[PDB]
Design a protein around this ligand. Sequence first.
Ligand SMILES: CC(=O)N[C@@H]1[C@@H](O)[C@H](O[C@@H]2O[C@H](CO)[C@H](O)[C@H](O[C@]3(C(=O)O)C[C@H](O)[C@@H](NC(C)=O)[C@H]([C@H](O)[C@H](O)CO)O3)[C@H]2O)[C@@H](COS(=O)(=O)O)O[C@H]1O
Ligand SMILES: CC(=O)N[C@@H]1[C@@H](O)[C@H](O[C@@H]2O[C@H](CO)[C@H](O)[C@H](O[C@]3(C(=O)O)C[C@H](O)[C@@H](NC(C)=O)[C@H]([C@H](O)[C@H](O)CO)O3)[C@H]2O)[C@@H](COS(=O)(=O)O)O[C@H]1O
Ligand SMILES: CC(=O)N[C@@H]1[C@@H](O)[C@@H](F)[C@@](OP(=O)(O)OC[C@H]2O[C@@H](n3ccc(N)nc3=O)[C@H](O)[C@@H]2O)(C(=O)O)O[C@H]1[C@H](O)[C@H](O)CO
Ligand SMILES: CC(=O)N[C@@H]1[C@@H](O)[C@@H](F)[C@@](OP(=O)(O)OC[C@H]2O[C@@H](n3ccc(N)nc3=O)[C@H](O)[C@@H]2O)(C(=O)O)O[C@H]1[C@H](O)[C@H](O)CO
Ligand SMILES: *[C@@H]1O[C@H](CO[C@@H]2O[C@@H](C)[C@@H](O)[C@@H](O)[C@@H]2O)[C@@H](O[C@@H]2O[C@H](CO)[C@@H](O)[C@H](O)[C@H]2NC(C)=O)[C@H](O)[C@H]1NC(C)=O
Ligand SMILES: *[C@@H]1O[C@H](CO)[C@@H](O[C@@H]2O[C@H](CO)[C@@H](O)[C@H](O)[C@H]2NC(C)=O)[C@H](O)[C@H]1NC(C)=O
Ligand SMILES: *[C@@H]1O[C@H](CO)[C@@H](O[C@@H]2O[C@H](CO)[C@@H](O)[C@H](O)[C@H]2NC(C)=O)[C@H](O)[C@H]1NC(C)=O
Ligand SMILES: *[C@@H]1O[C@H](CO)[C@@H](O[C@@H]2O[C@H](CO)[C@@H](O)[C@H](O)[C@H]2NC(C)=O)[C@H](O)[C@H]1NC(C)=O
Ligand SMILES: *[C@@H]1O[C@H](CO)[C@@H](O[C@@H]2O[C@H](CO)[C@@H](O)[C@H](O)[C@H]2NC(C)=O)[C@H](O)[C@H]1NC(C)=O
Ligand SMILES: *[C@@H]1O[C@H](CO)[C@@H](O)[C@H](O)[C@H]1NC(C)=O
Ligand SMILES: *[C@@H]1O[C@H](CO)[C@@H](O)[C@H](O)[C@H]1NC(C)=O
Ligand SMILES: *[C@@H]1O[C@H](CO)[C@@H](O)[C@H](O)[C@H]1NC(C)=O
Lengths: 286, 277
Amino acid sequence: WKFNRTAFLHQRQEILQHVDVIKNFSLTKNSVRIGQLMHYDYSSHKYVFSISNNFRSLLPDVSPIMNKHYNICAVVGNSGILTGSQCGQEIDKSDFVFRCNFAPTEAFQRDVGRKTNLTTFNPSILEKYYNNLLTIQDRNNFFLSLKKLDGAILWIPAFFFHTSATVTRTLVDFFVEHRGQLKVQLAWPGNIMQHVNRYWKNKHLSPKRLSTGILMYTLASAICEEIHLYGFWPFGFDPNTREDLPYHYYDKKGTKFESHQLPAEFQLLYRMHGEGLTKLTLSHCA
Amino acid sequence: WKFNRTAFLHQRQEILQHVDVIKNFSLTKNSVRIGQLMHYDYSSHKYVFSISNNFRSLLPDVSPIMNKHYNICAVVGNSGILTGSQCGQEIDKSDFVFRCNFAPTEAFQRDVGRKTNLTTFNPSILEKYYNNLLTIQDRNNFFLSLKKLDGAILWIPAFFFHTSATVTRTLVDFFVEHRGQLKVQLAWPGNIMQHVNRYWKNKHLSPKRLSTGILMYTLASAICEEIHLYGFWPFGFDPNTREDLPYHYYDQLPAEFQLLYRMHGEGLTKLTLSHCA
Ligand SMILES: CC(=O)N[C@@H]1[C@@H](O)[C@H](O[C@@H]2O[C@H](CO)[C@H](O)[C@H](O[C@]3(C(=O)O)C[C@H](O)[C@@H](NC(C)=O)[C@H]([C@H](O)[C@H](O)CO)O3)[C@H]2O)[C@@H](COS(=O)(=O)O)O[C@H]1O
Ligand SMILES: CC(=O)N[C@@H]1[C@@H](O)[C@H](O[C@@H]2O[C@H](CO)[C@H](O)[C@H](O[C@]3(C(=O)O)C[C@H](O)[C@@H](NC(C)=O)[C@H]([C@H](O)[C@H](O)CO)O3)[C@H]2O)[C@@H](COS(=O)(=O)O)O[C@H]1O
Ligand SMILES: CC(=O)N[C@@H]1[C@@H](O)[C@@H](F)[C@@](OP(=O)(O)OC[C@H]2O[C@@H](n3ccc(N)nc3=O)[C@H](O)[C@@H]2O)(C(=O)O)O[C@H]1[C@H](O)[C@H](O)CO
Ligand SMILES: CC(=O)N[C@@H]1[C@@H](O)[C@@H](F)[C@@](OP(=O)(O)OC[C@H]2O[C@@H](n3ccc(N)nc3=O)[C@H](O)[C@@H]2O)(C(=O)O)O[C@H]1[C@H](O)[C@H](O)CO
Ligand SMILES: *[C@@H]1O[C@H](CO[C@@H]2O[C@@H](C)[C@@H](O)[C@@H](O)[C@@H]2O)[C@@H](O[C@@H]2O[C@H](CO)[C@@H](O)[C@H](O)[C@H]2NC(C)=O)[C@H](O)[C@H]1NC(C)=O
Ligand SMILES: *[C@@H]1O[C@H](CO)[C@@H](O[C@@H]2O[C@H](CO)[C@@H](O)[C@H](O)[C@H]2NC(C)=O)[C@H](O)[C@H]1NC(C)=O
Ligand SMILES: *[C@@H]1O[C@H](CO)[C@@H](O[C@@H]2O[C@H](CO)[C@@H](O)[C@H](O)[C@H]2NC(C)=O)[C@H](O)[C@H]1NC(C)=O
Ligand SMILES: *[C@@H]1O[C@H](CO)[C@@H](O[C@@H]2O[C@H](CO)[C@@H](O)[C@H](O)[C@H]2NC(C)=O)[C@H](O)[C@H]1NC(C)=O
Ligand SMILES: *[C@@H]1O[C@H](CO)[C@@H](O[C@@H]2O[C@H](CO)[C@@H](O)[C@H](O)[C@H]2NC(C)=O)[C@H](O)[C@H]1NC(C)=O
Ligand SMILES: *[C@@H]1O[C@H](CO)[C@@H](O)[C@H](O)[C@H]1NC(C)=O
Ligand SMILES: *[C@@H]1O[C@H](CO)[C@@H](O)[C@H](O)[C@H]1NC(C)=O
Ligand SMILES: *[C@@H]1O[C@H](CO)[C@@H](O)[C@H](O)[C@H]1NC(C)=O
């Protein structure tokens, strides 16, 4: 595979025509008022969420990616194809690693690496794995996971669907309560999907909802010189051996495989791979 | 029915030996610290709720019932027995009316009255009737209902069960957001049920959970000279007409009812089970 830098820089430019990526990356203190009602990207207009004093105080003063440049970025999706890949070392060699939905790395370092400079956080994660921080043990458990992220960016899309409302309140209270004890940089994108969709609509991709992976590719394009994709393979068989693969690399070996058209996303990324825009890894790195 | 004032004043003294009612009525700003962890009365100790700056700012500075003394109080429970009772007028004649769980009055004035000086708010009400304030319309509805409460007290027990955690955050944010626009006096009791249960334990009543009604009786005893009960009847037939009755008038309780009937018979309180007209 040979990187075609020119083609990729052309893609970046084309993305920037539809997406102000530096701005879209996160709301900032001065871009919202206290009390302001937010709507949700994928919900009916009637659904709203008021920004408290507290929520606003958690927003960054300036975009966390402003004047940032990384040469080689890894964007790591969560496919079961990473299991046994030994891509850890190659991923960690990147200048910047994006991960998705707070995926675990410690237990899987050999395959997925231990370097994390950004991880996303679908709010459902707090309900699904941290019980909405209802108990002392869940609170401790979340706190430790966050501490292990050190100074990475935690990218929390709270305004895409209205079911995030309650978790957002819980998160805001937890982060205010623990202000000063964590180095994680919070980032909170607003209603950005009408802009992100515009780019991918021209490539003949428009599902109900773009996936987190492709949303990370989109932002990486603004600040990375060369993007290398890992963990993008939304199928239930290994492309080589054909053995059952779980949907996620941290599902129990065994596990059997709505709004996404992940296959169409994949075919489009494979296409880009072939044009030299980006490197999609589908095999063992070692 | 003839009030036995002496028996009632003895009951009040006995309640006050176990329950500092005026204090237990509500947490106040200075009785919690920011970042303090609250436990829940009926939940395992592991469940906690961290006091936010915002939650604290919604607490009253002093108990809203301190030095309030009313003569006749109505405590209105939510039984379907009120339907067609025409007790509205007799309820509204009271000096002070307690209602339960934000029950509706407008559509039912003739039967339940329109006077409200306190209403309780099980946090589940927000989920059940206001959709967690997720929409503009639910927010508008809740706002108007609250505005109609004028300067009444809204008594919100948020620390009895851990399922109230999330809705507490929703409520806090809504009240902070509308700070200045509502005259309602918020009240937020803490962990009071070990004290309240002590009084009722001696009367041979101890279920998993005392009902809101009997909790309102307990508090009314401290600030009312005479309590009159309406909407207390947890059974599915009407004692007079014998027709099926809904549980609520806008659709162990038996031990509680038998105990209140007992108190009625002793002249402590007046339990109305019939049409007022
Ligand atoms: C009761 C029932 O089955 N109803 C379902 C809806 O719950 C369901 O919506 C999704 O529900 C989950 C909770 O289990 C989440 O609330 C989800 O919201 C997120 C999420 O937190 O996971 C919101 C994030 O902002 C999204 N992240 C993005 C867009 O990058 C994220 C993401 O789109 C999904 O995780 C999909 O991978 O969703 C609710 O969307 C709904 C099914 O729709 S969807 O497949 O989730 O699009 O269907 C109702 O009937
Ligand atoms: C999964 C399942 O079915 N488990 C049930 C629980 O549903 C049940 O929990 C009660 O859950 C309801 C859900 O609507 C409420 O969250 C309730 O909490 C309140 C309430 O908000 O209504 C908490 C209030 O502070 C209580 N007010 C008081 C004590 O004055 C109030 C009160 O006890 C009412 O009778 C119930 O509304 O409850 C949760 O307690 C759980 C316990 O059942 S029960 O409500 O005692 O009947 O039982 C599980 O089986
Ligand atoms: C249970 C459930 O519904 N799983 C969804 C899943 O449909 C997926 F859509 C997505 O992301 P998630 O699986 O974490 O995976 C991160 C990204 O990796 C790529 N990928 C993933 C698996 C795979 N086999 N081939 C791939 O290509 C996709 O671009 C995906 O967006 C999402 O928001 O897009 O979110 C999760 C969960 O909400 C999340 O993991 C909570 O812990
Ligand atoms: C399903 C559910 O969650 N229902 C509960 C219910 O188990 C009951 F426990 C109680 O109160 P709720 O029914 O509104 O009624 C107020 C009081 O009226 C008396 N009563 C009621 C019905 C009846 N036929 N005869 C009576 O004697 C009881 O003293 C009760 O305390 C509570 O905490 O006591 O709270 C409600 C809900 O939280 C509320 O209605 C949501 O809007
Ligand atoms: C930015 O990275 C490019 C590309 O680096 C190469 O490919 C990466 C994925 C990784 O494998 C690197 O180790 C590879 O070197 C660098 O461009 C290369 O630079 C080296 C150093 O002089 C040179 O030997 C190669 O010929 C160049 N290769 C290509 C394809 O252009 C570049 O040096 C990096 N720049 C900075 C400032 O980090
Ligand atoms: C890099 O990719 C681009 C994107 O398609 C290629 O650029 C165009 O290629 C076609 C080939 O006929 C021409 O129509 C254009 O004139 C090319 N653009 C430019 C700016 O020259 C390019 O061929 C690719 N480079 C490599 C090494 O494959
Ligand atoms: C990307 O994130 C990693 C952490 O995963 C950062 O690398 C660490 O930096 C600290 C401080 O220098 C070192 O002590 C660690 O040894 C590094 N850890 C790993 C796993 O490599 C890295 O510097 C971040 N890169 C950025 C922000 O460009
Ligand atoms: C509810 O009221 C009871 C009093 O009836 C309070 O309990 C007393 O608290 C003081 C000071 O903390 C103790 O020294 C007493 O011994 C307690 N009395 C009993 C009988 O235990 C209680 O603090 C009040 N609680 C709230 C939240 O208001
Ligand atoms: C109890 O609450 C009621 C409201 O439900 C109060 O009565 C209202 O008071 C205003 C101001 O004095 C009057 O203009 C209204 O006509 C009254 N409304 C009703 C329905 O009677 C009443 O004052 C409150 N009582 C106490 C003791 O606080
Ligand atoms: C996203 O970018 C567009 C320009 O692409 C802009 O007009 C809009 O405000 C942005 N939205 C954000 C940062 O939420
Ligand atoms: C009223 O109640 C008290 C307490 O039991 C009792 O001693 C008194 O005799 C009663 N008086 C009546 C029924 O007139
Ligand atoms: C209490 O109400 C009754 C009934 O009208 C009345 O007769 C009695 O004197 C009232 N007032 C006081 C201060 O007790």
